[PDB]
Enzyme design. Sequence first.
Site, PDB file in Angstrom:
ATOM      1  N   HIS A 174       0.799  -1.234   0.000  1.00  0.00           N
ATOM      2  CA  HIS A 174       0.000   0.000   0.000  1.00  0.00           C
ATOM      3  C   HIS A 174       0.822   1.271   0.000  1.00  0.00           C
ATOM      4  CE1 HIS A 174      -4.143  -1.437   0.418  1.00  0.00           C
ATOM      5  NE2 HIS A 174      -3.698  -2.342   1.283  1.00  0.00           N
ATOM      6  N   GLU A 214      -6.770  -2.763  -3.863  1.00  0.00           N
ATOM      7  CA  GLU A 214      -6.218  -4.045  -3.406  1.00  0.00           C
ATOM      8  C   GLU A 214      -5.805  -4.956  -4.569  1.00  0.00           C
ATOM      9  OE1 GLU A 214      -5.405  -4.707  -0.226  1.00  0.00           O
ATOM     10  OE2 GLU A 214      -6.551  -3.222   0.847  1.00  0.00           O
ATOM     11  N   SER A 233       1.878  -7.696  -2.597  1.00  0.00           N
ATOM     12  CA  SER A 233       2.483  -8.396  -1.458  1.00  0.00           C
ATOM     13  C   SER A 233       2.267  -9.904  -1.498  1.00  0.00           C
ATOM     14  CB  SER A 233       1.948  -7.851  -0.125  1.00  0.00           C
ATOM     15  OG  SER A 233       0.547  -8.075   0.016  1.00  0.00           O
TER      16      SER A 233
HETATM   17  C1  LIG Z   1     -13.102  -2.422   2.163  1.00  0.00           C
HETATM   18  C2  LIG Z   1     -12.963  -3.865   2.689  1.00  0.00           C
HETATM   19  N1  LIG Z   1     -12.525  -3.863   4.106  1.00  0.00           N
HETATM   20  C3  LIG Z   1     -13.428  -3.786   5.087  1.00  0.00           C
HETATM   21  O1  LIG Z   1     -14.631  -3.742   4.840  1.00  0.00           O
HETATM   22  N2  LIG Z   1     -13.005  -3.775   6.399  1.00  0.00           N
HETATM   23  C4  LIG Z   1     -11.674  -3.839   6.710  1.00  0.00           C
HETATM   24  O2  LIG Z   1     -11.380  -3.805   7.918  1.00  0.00           O
HETATM   25  C5  LIG Z   1     -10.780  -3.914   5.701  1.00  0.00           C
HETATM   26  C6  LIG Z   1     -11.221  -3.925   4.417  1.00  0.00           C
HETATM   27  N3  LIG Z   1     -10.180  -3.991   3.593  1.00  0.00           N
HETATM   28  C7  LIG Z   1      -9.103  -4.053   4.355  1.00  0.00           C
HETATM   29  C8  LIG Z   1      -7.686  -4.101   3.767  1.00  0.00           C
HETATM   30  C9  LIG Z   1      -7.161  -5.454   3.362  1.00  0.00           C
HETATM   31  C10 LIG Z   1      -7.661  -6.671   3.595  1.00  0.00           C
HETATM   32  N4  LIG Z   1      -6.792  -7.550   3.055  1.00  0.00           N
HETATM   33  C11 LIG Z   1      -6.608  -8.881   2.879  1.00  0.00           C
HETATM   34  C12 LIG Z   1      -5.472  -9.213   2.225  1.00  0.00           C
HETATM   35  C13 LIG Z   1      -5.012 -10.646   1.883  1.00  0.00           C
HETATM   36  S1  LIG Z   1      -4.592  -7.838   1.785  1.00  0.00           S
HETATM   37  C14 LIG Z   1      -5.773  -6.833   2.518  1.00  0.00           C
HETATM   38  N5  LIG Z   1      -5.994  -5.544   2.717  1.00  0.00           N
HETATM   39  N6  LIG Z   1      -9.432  -3.992   5.654  1.00  0.00           N
HETATM   40  C15 LIG Z   1      -8.474  -4.047   6.849  1.00  0.00           C
HETATM   41  C16 LIG Z   1      -8.529  -5.332   7.518  1.00  0.00           C
HETATM   42  C17 LIG Z   1      -8.005  -5.501   8.808  1.00  0.00           C
HETATM   43  C18 LIG Z   1      -8.036  -6.735   9.461  1.00  0.00           C
HETATM   44  C19 LIG Z   1      -8.623  -7.863   8.889  1.00  0.00           C
HETATM   45  C20 LIG Z   1      -8.613  -9.051   9.559  1.00  0.00           C
HETATM   46  C21 LIG Z   1      -8.907 -10.253   9.055  1.00  0.00           C
HETATM   47  C22 LIG Z   1      -8.735 -11.154  10.029  1.00  0.00           C
HETATM   48  N7  LIG Z   1      -8.334 -10.505  11.128  1.00  0.00           N
HETATM   49  C23 LIG Z   1      -8.030 -11.112  12.452  1.00  0.00           C
HETATM   50  N8  LIG Z   1      -8.239  -9.212  10.825  1.00  0.00           N
HETATM   51  C24 LIG Z   1      -9.175  -7.709   7.611  1.00  0.00           C
HETATM   52  C25 LIG Z   1      -9.123  -6.468   6.957  1.00  0.00           C
HETATM   53 FE   LIG Z   2      -4.790  -4.015   1.862  1.00  0.00          FE
END
Ligand SMILES: CCn1c(=O)[nH]c(=O)c2c1nc(Cc1cn3cc(C)sc3n1)n2Cc1ccc(-c2ccn(C)n2)cc1
Ligand SMILES: [Fe+3]
Length: 291
Positions: A174, A214, A233
């Site tokens: 990112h 993403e 990544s």
């Molecule tokens: C708009 C969709 N969207 C959402 O709705 N909400 C988000 O919170 C979100 C997101 N998108 C991203 C970013 C992200 C999610 N993700 C998965 C990858 C493989 S690389 C990557 N970047 N996040 C941040 C995020 C932070 C933590 C988790 C997670 C999964 C399992 N655990 C314990 N934590 C999952 C996502």
């Molecule tokens: Fe991400």
Amino acid sequence: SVPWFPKKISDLDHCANRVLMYGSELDADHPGFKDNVYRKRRKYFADLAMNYKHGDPIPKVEFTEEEIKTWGTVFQELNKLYPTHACREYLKNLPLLSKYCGYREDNIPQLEDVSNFLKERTGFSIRPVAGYLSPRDFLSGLAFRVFHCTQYVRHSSDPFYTPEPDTCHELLGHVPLLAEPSFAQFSQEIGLASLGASEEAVQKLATCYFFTVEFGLCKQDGQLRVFGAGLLSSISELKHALSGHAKVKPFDPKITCKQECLITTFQDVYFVSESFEDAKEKMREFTKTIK
Ligand SMILES: CCn1c(=O)[nH]c(=O)c2c1nc(Cc1cn3cc(C)sc3n1)n2Cc1ccc(-c2ccn(C)n2)cc1
Ligand SMILES: [Fe+3]
């Protein structure tokens, strides 16, 4: 009626904590699921994020030898691929991060240092996040040029693959694009469009975010290149996306927002943006129709 939304950057204190799944709550199939030491480490990171308040310096972490080795392994292999795979904006900013933020094989950059670098370049900043947020709360950060970032490192048993975000993904996937003004404006406008939007609108914006920020591809000088952080990544999917084996379609929000976002596999389709400027214009046209 209109749902609550943050009105200033410190208001993210109120939604950034509305965590639906804490970072310590590992998936059953996580390589660290039975690793009590790793679980305790993940609780440490999640607590740091929970206790963070806007205005604080992001807490500095002493990464372990094991964590640094995992980073180095990922860093080395991905950097061999970036010259032939990544978009020009990514390649322009990556060397600036080695110079100013300590991106090296044997050093994991601190989020505070990267945040300060982004603030100077595009006004973006980082907030450590304590787990999964609703798409509304996650996207709202972008409206204030705040990227919600994980601070922990993926489990060492599987350096090259993970379906979960980790700090290797944030820093290598990112951050180099958040340093690019055109991309920063594109990202901010996703956040701004989401503020106070309907649940339906937020979901569509989140799908558009997924297939650009993403997992986006772009076309530059006639070539297909990668700008999506999830590709940048993931060594296996980065290679896959520019192989002849991937289905690719033009980025077009009314069509893109219909596509399912896949989690534990390669994507079934990738969307190609003509440029960040053009993706931004297409989202402007689209947001008029859903708000
Ligand atoms: C708009 C969709 N969207 C959402 O709705 N909400 C988000 O919170 C979100 C997101 N998108 C991203 C970013 C992200 C999610 N993700 C998965 C990858 C493989 S690389 C990557 N970047 N996040 C941040 C995020 C932070 C933590 C988790 C997670 C999964 C399992 N655990 C314990 N934590 C999952 C996502
Ligand atoms: Fe991400």
